[PDB]
């Protein structure tokens, strides 16, 4: 049941992808650690909540 | 459209009511989410729901308020503001539970020689600050819910000192959004600005927002409509000008559960 | 209905979801979820109190926010009996959970203790 | 066996593209904030830019990353006196919440609704109170979780501490700080950082005082309480202990953003208090 | 059904309300026509109709009346009788036009030792006779429409003689069906008989009947519910016996048009 | 090596089905407790119900789950005095 | 001898089934932890212990 | 049965005894389990068992008690109540061990003009409280 993943490597030694192994000991999801393998989304719903899609090169008001 | 069509000119139609506007700055749809009925996958109350449709899902025009050099701002709460509006208020009071979206149309026209900017904001769970410094969360149900006439903001925080017989009401200070946070940031919330030189009004399409699929419309207000003067009203040279701000709102894809005898609230 | 076979009658069993004036008269009770029970061969009558709530779960204690509403009973018409028959009888009442029913967050009860 | 492993929180931000001069009918710089929208502009739209390969990431600013830190929500005080003392053995009872302290509360409050598995870590420290010289054997603490409805303890040693059903943590002094995980336990589809309403509906036909309730306050008892005590029997020499509770929100989700708390917190609600309403400092319009 | 099923035992369910009966004489469907919504081919008013569904299409129980050796009979009018009933009355008053069918359930139980027969009749356009011999068609709107409490029949015609200040109300004589025709023939109309020795009640399913597809529910009453004692109440030996007659009714496939401000009638 | 993994204690309870009006000879609401049995009724039998996708579970109310908790059955008292003590 | 199973996942992170690994160290079943992988059964034997199967739509007594 | 058959009318027959009833509310089978002999897979005592069959597996009628406005209730224990009943009690006393199921038929008729409800309960290991 071992879950193997990739570490986004910062400062590399004078020493190919590096990995880290994770295994869940408990039956309850809540007991589990944070994956940190999270997703980004486009701000649109907040920065441009307007009915009629807007084109930056053209006049906002027309 | 080379054919004529434009962002500034719109026509909204709900049930037997229609709104027209030749000077609009487009329209806003809160969090990019258009109002919708409660899905089976997300439903809670098992009983056949009551969906008034055109009888309630139409445009109600509240009491017109006056904008002046002195005005610090105005506030309303949904559904509270529509509680006495025709078939919508009737169905809201007859049922234990109820959910509803809204099409908020704030009207405010003037002239090419007038100045001023109205900051129109739609705030989820708009909890406001009380008038007391000796006690907290004490604002009475009657005062927290002004109904159609709504409430207003103050440029200054003046504490209720009558410990014996407390006013038990809100003291919403303008620059602090009436709730402990800086007004300059209210823009993170679904909104539109009514800049006299650019547009007659503000149109906000609000979805049903909440920690629950459906709730108690009488006990709890989902949305808060805050209107503050970002830039003060000003005309030609008149020392004390004035212009009306008319607020028209329409419930949407609204539905109700847990039908019984009508709820007669102690509103005074 | 534990009364005699010769005894007829029609009762109104009601359920009124929270938020309003708790029913004190048939008129109000009749306006919400109810069942008009007619007394006959079939000794008993079952009224189902449907899962109607704002929150996904209710609290196992008295709480304004998670309140369930009101269950009331009335005389639709009136208990009628012939001569040589008892004008008074007893009705027993039973409660049970429907297959859509569940509980969570295991905890120690107050219905039993050990003072000492 | 082994299981190995669209835009990721840790993906490099968009590269800056080479942009030359412009003499056109296209007006990116010009707009209308009135519409409610924010101009999606980028350096290359208003100035001549060079080509730049972007390596920077928003990894650390993600919802989980932003809160992925143990925060102190309360300090519980308990004790174990000498049998003789006239005063009662002091056992602690804390109503669980993130509002007793300000730091974590302000962060969670950047948003209206939230959802998450809760990780509670307990740091226990003890000490001697009297200019005495007697000692005390290693203490064993009992942290009992009492959910709304269950018999709340009235004595450091009454029947309730049996915890037949309630979850209890038996911590041993001097050992690695205690820790337990808790699922999303809300009676709602998401935690409400704010409730613009009441737990009761004031009915005309019914006496004023009856229909009354606190503004912005839902379940009088949201999540029950934490009842802590020192299991060890009364010791000749009195020893006072303190239990620091660290709360960390994991597997977390948040909705509807809000402007951060600008002025000093005043109670569990949004209420502000006189003399604290002037956050910003003096700085002239034309001064750098 | 060898499985158990029977004509005498029924269970009716509409919206949040359910009616049970162990002693019924089957059920009647007026003119063999089950209530239905207004079809496009037959429709008149062009506006999107208001269909309350479960909120109004459920069972309302009116005020229980008392049946005795002396009783000459009782009468009600639809929709008039339901005008003050929850969401159904609200929607009826808010709209210019409205149409509705009904499931009429008349409840009246007793004992194997009691006697008597209640003639329960559903009459289309049940126009009743006035109390005046000097003038005609003079019965006032207030008196012609008793609401939920309904009216009653008289064994004798006694003319209103106060020419100066007329009672302006109905004088419905029992044996003449309150309208100039012989009661013995009322049976040509959709009906059922509540014969104490045979059954507890009477169930009549009434369709929307009228010269028009849809009409003014406030100005005009489509159906008349007449209940007369075909055979007088009688018990063991008691000289003055008594038994209740409870009347429960439910609007069906009902719909409304021409929405505006609520109609506040002069009912007194 | 690795071994991976009918109604389960943690399976979602039965979905509520959409139910309309009724004018029939069928009498679910009516019964007879005398027989020793309990009426298997559900909301849709006595009232008009909407369609609801049920997510709730009886996981925590299972026999193991109900008792899956360490409970105090006794408190034993022992000691270690000074050699001299008479007791 | 490793026993891999599925966690019924509650509150999911902004981060497909998740698993947990279990291994038995002792020879005696009693030493083992509780699987919690338990079964439900129909209340019938208690709610309807009657000889003649009952149909809810029909008259209990006939 | 369109043929006549019904829940209220039953006929029970065991050995030389038969019980009839025209007014019954069906019949109950404890935990849905019908009485049965001890299986080989579950057996303990190795000796050839004594199975009286019809001699003991029949209907014994105990002393009839009187129900009145004053009555608070009655109780019995099995097999204790049948200990002195013909061949069943004899075989029970002659043997160290014994196991048995039961068909309990409580009879109580009146009239369409009488009222009242008797709660008849079968309780496993019915341990009762003492007078001290
Ligand atoms: C032995 C230790 C057991 C620990 C038991 C902890 C269970 C209770 C956790 C409750 C979580 C509350 C988190 C904050 C919720 C608030 O924001 C609410 N007012 C919002 O809905
Ligand atoms: C999937 O996990 C199969 C590979 C197992 C690797 C060995 C596991 C190391 C110890 C795990 C026991 C789990 C603790 C409850
Ligand atoms: C089946 O278990 C084969 C896989 C073994 C995985 C490594 C086991 C981890 C340590 C186990 C030793 C057992 C302790 C007595």
mmCIF file with all atom_site columns, N, CA and C in Angstrom, chain F residues 4-58:
data_model
loop_
_atom_site.group_PDB
_atom_site.id
_atom_site.type_symbol
_atom_site.label_atom_id
_atom_site.label_alt_id
_atom_site.label_comp_id
_atom_site.label_asym_id
_atom_site.label_entity_id
_atom_site.label_seq_id
_atom_site.pdbx_PDB_ins_code
_atom_site.Cartn_x
_atom_site.Cartn_y
_atom_site.Cartn_z
_atom_site.occupancy
_atom_site.B_iso_or_equiv
_atom_site.pdbx_formal_charge
_atom_site.auth_seq_id
_atom_site.auth_comp_id
_atom_site.auth_asym_id
_atom_site.auth_atom_id
_atom_site.pdbx_PDB_model_num
ATOM 1   N N  . UNK F 1 4  ? -4.850  -7.253 -1.130 1.00 0.00 ? 4  UNK F N  1
ATOM 2   C CA . UNK F 1 4  ? -5.752  -6.006 -1.234 1.00 0.00 ? 4  UNK F CA 1
ATOM 3   C C  . UNK F 1 4  ? -7.297  -6.204 -0.845 1.00 0.00 ? 4  UNK F C  1
ATOM 4   N N  . UNK F 1 5  ? -7.945  -5.118 -0.754 1.00 0.00 ? 5  UNK F N  1
ATOM 5   C CA . UNK F 1 5  ? -9.427  -5.122 -0.318 1.00 0.00 ? 5  UNK F CA 1
ATOM 6   C C  . UNK F 1 5  ? -10.291 -3.827 -0.627 1.00 0.00 ? 5  UNK F C  1
ATOM 7   N N  . UNK F 1 6  ? -23.934 -8.897 2.277  1.00 0.00 ? 6  UNK F N  1
ATOM 8   C CA . UNK F 1 6  ? -23.004 -7.807 1.530  1.00 0.00 ? 6  UNK F CA 1
ATOM 9   C C  . UNK F 1 6  ? -23.001 -6.309 2.034  1.00 0.00 ? 6  UNK F C  1
ATOM 10  N N  . UNK F 1 7  ? -24.135 -5.948 2.541  1.00 0.00 ? 7  UNK F N  1
ATOM 11  C CA . UNK F 1 7  ? -24.264 -4.518 3.094  1.00 0.00 ? 7  UNK F CA 1
ATOM 12  C C  . UNK F 1 7  ? -23.316 -4.043 4.283  1.00 0.00 ? 7  UNK F C  1
ATOM 13  N N  . UNK F 1 8  ? -22.393 -3.246 3.895  1.00 0.00 ? 8  UNK F N  1
ATOM 14  C CA . UNK F 1 8  ? -21.399 -2.706 4.931  1.00 0.00 ? 8  UNK F CA 1
ATOM 15  C C  . UNK F 1 8  ? -21.916 -1.647 5.990  1.00 0.00 ? 8  UNK F C  1
ATOM 16  N N  . UNK F 1 9  ? -21.477 -1.877 7.186  1.00 0.00 ? 9  UNK F N  1
ATOM 17  C CA . UNK F 1 9  ? -21.877 -0.865 8.278  1.00 0.00 ? 9  UNK F CA 1
ATOM 18  C C  . UNK F 1 9  ? -21.739 0.672  7.864  1.00 0.00 ? 9  UNK F C  1
ATOM 19  N N  . UNK F 1 10 ? -20.746 0.827  7.020  1.00 0.00 ? 10 UNK F N  1
ATOM 20  C CA . UNK F 1 10 ? -20.482 2.242  6.501  1.00 0.00 ? 10 UNK F CA 1
ATOM 21  C C  . UNK F 1 10 ? -21.033 2.636  5.068  1.00 0.00 ? 10 UNK F C  1
ATOM 22  N N  . UNK F 1 11 ? -21.906 1.776  4.633  1.00 0.00 ? 11 UNK F N  1
ATOM 23  C CA . UNK F 1 11 ? -22.608 2.085  3.306  1.00 0.00 ? 11 UNK F CA 1
ATOM 24  C C  . UNK F 1 11 ? -23.755 3.190  3.443  1.00 0.00 ? 11 UNK F C  1
ATOM 25  N N  . UNK F 1 12 ? -23.768 4.028  2.500  1.00 0.00 ? 12 UNK F N  1
ATOM 26  C CA . UNK F 1 12 ? -24.879 5.090  2.548  1.00 0.00 ? 12 UNK F CA 1
ATOM 27  C C  . UNK F 1 12 ? -26.386 4.572  2.660  1.00 0.00 ? 12 UNK F C  1
ATOM 28  N N  . UNK F 1 13 ? -27.035 5.100  3.635  1.00 0.00 ? 13 UNK F N  1
ATOM 29  C CA . UNK F 1 13 ? -28.487 4.675  3.798  1.00 0.00 ? 13 UNK F CA 1
ATOM 30  C C  . UNK F 1 13 ? -29.388 4.901  2.524  1.00 0.00 ? 13 UNK F C  1
ATOM 31  N N  . UNK F 1 14 ? -30.413 4.163  2.479  1.00 0.00 ? 14 UNK F N  1
ATOM 32  C CA . UNK F 1 14 ? -31.345 4.262  1.267  1.00 0.00 ? 14 UNK F CA 1
ATOM 33  C C  . UNK F 1 14 ? -31.886 5.676  0.808  1.00 0.00 ? 14 UNK F C  1
ATOM 34  N N  . UNK F 1 15 ? -31.656 5.924  -0.439 1.00 0.00 ? 15 UNK F N  1
ATOM 35  C CA . UNK F 1 15 ? -32.199 7.217  -0.992 1.00 0.00 ? 15 UNK F CA 1
ATOM 36  C C  . UNK F 1 15 ? -33.765 7.491  -0.963 1.00 0.00 ? 15 UNK F C  1
ATOM 37  N N  . UNK F 1 16 ? -34.061 8.653  -0.555 1.00 0.00 ? 16 UNK F N  1
ATOM 38  C CA . UNK F 1 16 ? -35.544 9.028  -0.558 1.00 0.00 ? 16 UNK F CA 1
ATOM 39  C C  . UNK F 1 16 ? -36.178 9.283  -1.993 1.00 0.00 ? 16 UNK F C  1
ATOM 40  N N  . UNK F 1 17 ? -37.046 8.410  -2.314 1.00 0.00 ? 17 UNK F N  1
ATOM 41  C CA . UNK F 1 17 ? -37.713 8.543  -3.676 1.00 0.00 ? 17 UNK F CA 1
ATOM 42  C C  . UNK F 1 17 ? -38.948 9.505  -3.929 1.00 0.00 ? 17 UNK F C  1
ATOM 43  N N  . UNK F 1 18 ? -38.780 10.236 -4.983 1.00 0.00 ? 18 UNK F N  1
ATOM 44  C CA . UNK F 1 18 ? -39.949 11.168 -5.344 1.00 0.00 ? 18 UNK F CA 1
ATOM 45  C C  . UNK F 1 18 ? -41.409 10.519 -5.369 1.00 0.00 ? 18 UNK F C  1
ATOM 46  N N  . UNK F 1 19 ? -42.181 11.021 -4.511 1.00 0.00 ? 19 UNK F N  1
ATOM 47  C CA . UNK F 1 19 ? -43.616 10.478 -4.394 1.00 0.00 ? 19 UNK F CA 1
ATOM 48  C C  . UNK F 1 19 ? -44.808 11.507 -4.566 1.00 0.00 ? 19 UNK F C  1
ATOM 49  N N  . UNK F 1 20 ? -45.636 11.174 -5.483 1.00 0.00 ? 20 UNK F N  1
ATOM 50  C CA . UNK F 1 20 ? -46.822 12.088 -5.755 1.00 0.00 ? 20 UNK F CA 1
ATOM 51  C C  . UNK F 1 20 ? -48.150 11.742 -4.972 1.00 0.00 ? 20 UNK F C  1
ATOM 52  N N  . UNK F 1 21 ? -49.139 12.481 -5.339 1.00 0.00 ? 21 UNK F N  1
ATOM 53  C CA . UNK F 1 21 ? -50.505 12.222 -4.686 1.00 0.00 ? 21 UNK F CA 1
ATOM 54  C C  . UNK F 1 21 ? -51.114 10.759 -4.770 1.00 0.00 ? 21 UNK F C  1
ATOM 55  N N  . UNK F 1 22 ? -51.992 10.532 -3.889 1.00 0.00 ? 22 UNK F N  1
ATOM 56  C CA . UNK F 1 22 ? -52.644 9.155  -3.855 1.00 0.00 ? 22 UNK F CA 1
ATOM 57  C C  . UNK F 1 22 ? -54.160 9.022  -3.442 1.00 0.00 ? 22 UNK F C  1
ATOM 58  N N  . UNK F 1 23 ? -54.839 8.376  -4.281 1.00 0.00 ? 23 UNK F N  1
ATOM 59  C CA . UNK F 1 23 ? -56.326 8.071  -4.020 1.00 0.00 ? 23 UNK F CA 1
ATOM 60  C C  . UNK F 1 23 ? -56.702 6.548  -4.263 1.00 0.00 ? 23 UNK F C  1
ATOM 61  N N  . UNK F 1 24 ? -56.046 5.778  -3.445 1.00 0.00 ? 24 UNK F N  1
ATOM 62  C CA . UNK F 1 24 ? -56.194 4.271  -3.609 1.00 0.00 ? 24 UNK F CA 1
ATOM 63  C C  . UNK F 1 24 ? -56.715 3.362  -2.434 1.00 0.00 ? 24 UNK F C  1
ATOM 64  N N  . UNK F 1 25 ? -56.941 2.142  -2.854 1.00 0.00 ? 25 UNK F N  1
ATOM 65  C CA . UNK F 1 25 ? -57.387 1.115  -1.819 1.00 0.00 ? 25 UNK F CA 1
ATOM 66  C C  . UNK F 1 25 ? -56.241 0.572  -0.887 1.00 0.00 ? 25 UNK F C  1
ATOM 67  N N  . UNK F 1 26 ? -55.067 1.029  -1.280 1.00 0.00 ? 26 UNK F N  1
ATOM 68  C CA . UNK F 1 26 ? -53.849 0.688  -0.412 1.00 0.00 ? 26 UNK F CA 1
ATOM 69  C C  . UNK F 1 26 ? -53.619 1.533  0.928  1.00 0.00 ? 26 UNK F C  1
ATOM 70  N N  . UNK F 1 27 ? -53.614 0.821  1.966  1.00 0.00 ? 27 UNK F N  1
ATOM 71  C CA . UNK F 1 27 ? -53.518 1.515  3.311  1.00 0.00 ? 27 UNK F CA 1
ATOM 72  C C  . UNK F 1 27 ? -52.263 1.329  4.217  1.00 0.00 ? 27 UNK F C  1
ATOM 73  N N  . UNK F 1 28 ? -51.176 1.798  3.683  1.00 0.00 ? 28 UNK F N  1
ATOM 74  C CA . UNK F 1 28 ? -49.888 1.741  4.528  1.00 0.00 ? 28 UNK F CA 1
ATOM 75  C C  . UNK F 1 28 ? -49.946 2.348  5.996  1.00 0.00 ? 28 UNK F C  1
ATOM 76  N N  . UNK F 1 29 ? -50.523 3.530  5.978  1.00 0.00 ? 29 UNK F N  1
ATOM 77  C CA . UNK F 1 29 ? -50.728 4.234  7.338  1.00 0.00 ? 29 UNK F CA 1
ATOM 78  C C  . UNK F 1 29 ? -51.531 3.432  8.459  1.00 0.00 ? 29 UNK F C  1
ATOM 79  N N  . UNK F 1 30 ? -52.439 2.672  7.916  1.00 0.00 ? 30 UNK F N  1
ATOM 80  C CA . UNK F 1 30 ? -53.268 1.774  8.820  1.00 0.00 ? 30 UNK F CA 1
ATOM 81  C C  . UNK F 1 30 ? -52.624 0.372  9.151  1.00 0.00 ? 30 UNK F C  1
ATOM 82  N N  . UNK F 1 31 ? -52.699 0.057  10.372 1.00 0.00 ? 31 UNK F N  1
ATOM 83  C CA . UNK F 1 31 ? -52.096 -1.275 10.829 1.00 0.00 ? 31 UNK F CA 1
ATOM 84  C C  . UNK F 1 31 ? -52.611 -1.905 12.180 1.00 0.00 ? 31 UNK F C  1
ATOM 85  N N  . UNK F 1 32 ? -51.868 -2.839 12.606 1.00 0.00 ? 32 UNK F N  1
ATOM 86  C CA . UNK F 1 32 ? -52.228 -3.544 13.923 1.00 0.00 ? 32 UNK F CA 1
ATOM 87  C C  . UNK F 1 32 ? -51.065 -4.052 14.880 1.00 0.00 ? 32 UNK F C  1
ATOM 88  N N  . UNK F 1 33 ? -50.554 -3.079 15.589 1.00 0.00 ? 33 UNK F N  1
ATOM 89  C CA . UNK F 1 33 ? -49.415 -3.450 16.540 1.00 0.00 ? 33 UNK F CA 1
ATOM 90  C C  . UNK F 1 33 ? -49.581 -4.762 17.407 1.00 0.00 ? 33 UNK F C  1
ATOM 91  N N  . UNK F 1 34 ? -50.849 -5.070 17.574 1.00 0.00 ? 34 UNK F N  1
ATOM 92  C CA . UNK F 1 34 ? -51.143 -6.382 18.318 1.00 0.00 ? 34 UNK F CA 1
ATOM 93  C C  . UNK F 1 34 ? -50.379 -7.706 17.843 1.00 0.00 ? 34 UNK F C  1
ATOM 94  N N  . UNK F 1 35 ? -50.200 -7.665 16.545 1.00 0.00 ? 35 UNK F N  1
ATOM 95  C CA . UNK F 1 35 ? -49.428 -8.827 15.900 1.00 0.00 ? 35 UNK F CA 1
ATOM 96  C C  . UNK F 1 35 ? -47.931 -9.040 16.380 1.00 0.00 ? 35 UNK F C  1
ATOM 97  N N  . UNK F 1 36 ? -47.495 -8.015 17.053 1.00 0.00 ? 36 UNK F N  1
ATOM 98  C CA . UNK F 1 36 ? -46.058 -8.041 17.575 1.00 0.00 ? 36 UNK F CA 1
ATOM 99  C C  . UNK F 1 36 ? -45.010 -7.322 16.629 1.00 0.00 ? 36 UNK F C  1
ATOM 100 N N  . UNK F 1 37 ? -45.549 -6.968 15.506 1.00 0.00 ? 37 UNK F N  1
ATOM 101 C CA . UNK F 1 37 ? -44.674 -6.249 14.473 1.00 0.00 ? 37 UNK F CA 1
ATOM 102 C C  . UNK F 1 37 ? -44.710 -4.667 14.345 1.00 0.00 ? 37 UNK F C  1
ATOM 103 N N  . UNK F 1 38 ? -43.624 -4.190 13.873 1.00 0.00 ? 38 UNK F N  1
ATOM 104 C CA . UNK F 1 38 ? -43.524 -2.677 13.659 1.00 0.00 ? 38 UNK F CA 1
ATOM 105 C C  . UNK F 1 38 ? -43.635 -2.146 12.169 1.00 0.00 ? 38 UNK F C  1
ATOM 106 N N  . UNK F 1 39 ? -44.680 -1.408 11.971 1.00 0.00 ? 39 UNK F N  1
ATOM 107 C CA . UNK F 1 39 ? -44.885 -0.836 10.583 1.00 0.00 ? 39 UNK F CA 1
ATOM 108 C C  . UNK F 1 39 ? -43.679 -0.229 9.755  1.00 0.00 ? 39 UNK F C  1
ATOM 109 N N  . UNK F 1 40 ? -43.222 -1.041 8.877  1.00 0.00 ? 40 UNK F N  1
ATOM 110 C CA . UNK F 1 40 ? -42.027 -0.618 8.007  1.00 0.00 ? 40 UNK F CA 1
ATOM 111 C C  . UNK F 1 40 ? -42.145 0.683  7.114  1.00 0.00 ? 40 UNK F C  1
ATOM 112 N N  . UNK F 1 41 ? -42.981 1.540  7.598  1.00 0.00 ? 41 UNK F N  1
ATOM 113 C CA . UNK F 1 41 ? -43.232 2.810  6.836  1.00 0.00 ? 41 UNK F CA 1
ATOM 114 C C  . UNK F 1 41 ? -42.060 3.825  6.614  1.00 0.00 ? 41 UNK F C  1
ATOM 115 N N  . UNK F 1 42 ? -42.233 4.522  5.564  1.00 0.00 ? 42 UNK F N  1
ATOM 116 C CA . UNK F 1 42 ? -41.249 5.634  5.193  1.00 0.00 ? 42 UNK F CA 1
ATOM 117 C C  . UNK F 1 42 ? -41.923 6.964  4.641  1.00 0.00 ? 42 UNK F C  1
ATOM 118 N N  . UNK F 1 43 ? -41.371 8.028  5.056  1.00 0.00 ? 43 UNK F N  1
ATOM 119 C CA . UNK F 1 43 ? -41.985 9.357  4.585  1.00 0.00 ? 43 UNK F CA 1
ATOM 120 C C  . UNK F 1 43 ? -42.882 9.356  3.275  1.00 0.00 ? 43 UNK F C  1
ATOM 121 N N  . UNK F 1 44 ? -42.313 8.750  2.278  1.00 0.00 ? 44 UNK F N  1
ATOM 122 C CA . UNK F 1 44 ? -43.093 8.640  0.955  1.00 0.00 ? 44 UNK F CA 1
ATOM 123 C C  . UNK F 1 44 ? -44.473 7.846  0.977  1.00 0.00 ? 44 UNK F C  1
ATOM 124 N N  . UNK F 1 45 ? -44.619 7.163  2.069  1.00 0.00 ? 45 UNK F N  1
ATOM 125 C CA . UNK F 1 45 ? -45.918 6.368  2.278  1.00 0.00 ? 45 UNK F CA 1
ATOM 126 C C  . UNK F 1 45 ? -47.163 7.203  2.805  1.00 0.00 ? 45 UNK F C  1
ATOM 127 N N  . UNK F 1 46 ? -46.789 8.195  3.550  1.00 0.00 ? 46 UNK F N  1
ATOM 128 C CA . UNK F 1 46 ? -47.870 9.117  4.138  1.00 0.00 ? 46 UNK F CA 1
ATOM 129 C C  . UNK F 1 46 ? -47.874 10.633 3.689  1.00 0.00 ? 46 UNK F C  1
ATOM 130 N N  . UNK F 1 47 ? -46.870 10.926 2.942  1.00 0.00 ? 47 UNK F N  1
ATOM 131 C CA . UNK F 1 47 ? -46.740 12.331 2.365  1.00 0.00 ? 47 UNK F CA 1
ATOM 132 C C  . UNK F 1 47 ? -45.988 12.486 0.978  1.00 0.00 ? 47 UNK F C  1
ATOM 133 N N  . UNK F 1 48 ? -46.340 13.544 0.343  1.00 0.00 ? 48 UNK F N  1
ATOM 134 C CA . UNK F 1 48 ? -45.630 13.813 -0.986 1.00 0.00 ? 48 UNK F CA 1
ATOM 135 C C  . UNK F 1 48 ? -44.100 14.225 -0.884 1.00 0.00 ? 48 UNK F C  1
ATOM 136 N N  . UNK F 1 49 ? -43.323 13.273 -1.228 1.00 0.00 ? 49 UNK F N  1
ATOM 137 C CA . UNK F 1 49 ? -41.824 13.509 -1.144 1.00 0.00 ? 49 UNK F CA 1
ATOM 138 C C  . UNK F 1 49 ? -41.012 13.802 -2.461 1.00 0.00 ? 49 UNK F C  1
ATOM 139 N N  . UNK F 1 50 ? -39.994 14.533 -2.236 1.00 0.00 ? 50 UNK F N  1
ATOM 140 C CA . UNK F 1 50 ? -39.032 14.810 -3.400 1.00 0.00 ? 50 UNK F CA 1
ATOM 141 C C  . UNK F 1 50 ? -37.831 13.757 -3.490 1.00 0.00 ? 50 UNK F C  1
ATOM 142 N N  . UNK F 1 51 ? -37.248 13.729 -4.606 1.00 0.00 ? 51 UNK F N  1
ATOM 143 C CA . UNK F 1 51 ? -36.063 12.785 -4.725 1.00 0.00 ? 51 UNK F CA 1
ATOM 144 C C  . UNK F 1 51 ? -34.732 13.253 -3.996 1.00 0.00 ? 51 UNK F C  1
ATOM 145 N N  . UNK F 1 52 ? -34.356 12.447 -3.088 1.00 0.00 ? 52 UNK F N  1
ATOM 146 C CA . UNK F 1 52 ? -33.096 12.781 -2.310 1.00 0.00 ? 52 UNK F CA 1
ATOM 147 C C  . UNK F 1 52 ? -31.935 11.720 -2.233 1.00 0.00 ? 52 UNK F C  1
ATOM 148 N N  . UNK F 1 53 ? -30.860 12.126 -2.827 1.00 0.00 ? 53 UNK F N  1
ATOM 149 C CA . UNK F 1 53 ? -29.645 11.200 -2.769 1.00 0.00 ? 53 UNK F CA 1
ATOM 150 C C  . UNK F 1 53 ? -28.911 11.099 -1.369 1.00 0.00 ? 53 UNK F C  1
ATOM 151 N N  . UNK F 1 54 ? -29.292 10.071 -0.698 1.00 0.00 ? 54 UNK F N  1
ATOM 152 C CA . UNK F 1 54 ? -28.723 9.860  0.701  1.00 0.00 ? 54 UNK F CA 1
ATOM 153 C C  . UNK F 1 54 ? -27.200 9.489  0.892  1.00 0.00 ? 54 UNK F C  1
ATOM 154 N N  . UNK F 1 55 ? -26.558 10.390 1.548  1.00 0.00 ? 55 UNK F N  1
ATOM 155 C CA . UNK F 1 55 ? -25.075 10.168 1.853  1.00 0.00 ? 55 UNK F CA 1
ATOM 156 C C  . UNK F 1 55 ? -24.720 9.634  3.298  1.00 0.00 ? 55 UNK F C  1
ATOM 157 N N  . UNK F 1 56 ? -25.715 9.811  4.124  1.00 0.00 ? 56 UNK F N  1
ATOM 158 C CA . UNK F 1 56 ? -25.521 9.345  5.565  1.00 0.00 ? 56 UNK F CA 1
ATOM 159 C C  . UNK F 1 56 ? -25.287 7.805  5.838  1.00 0.00 ? 56 UNK F C  1
ATOM 160 N N  . UNK F 1 57 ? -24.488 7.613  6.804  1.00 0.00 ? 57 UNK F N  1
ATOM 161 C CA . UNK F 1 57 ? -24.111 6.180  7.195  1.00 0.00 ? 57 UNK F CA 1
ATOM 162 C C  . UNK F 1 57 ? -24.297 5.744  8.706  1.00 0.00 ? 57 UNK F C  1
ATOM 163 N N  . UNK F 1 58 ? -24.484 4.490  8.835  1.00 0.00 ? 58 UNK F N  1
ATOM 164 C CA . UNK F 1 58 ? -24.585 3.932  10.267 1.00 0.00 ? 58 UNK F CA 1
ATOM 165 C C  . UNK F 1 58 ? -23.223 3.359  10.854 1.00 0.00 ? 58 UNK F C  1
#
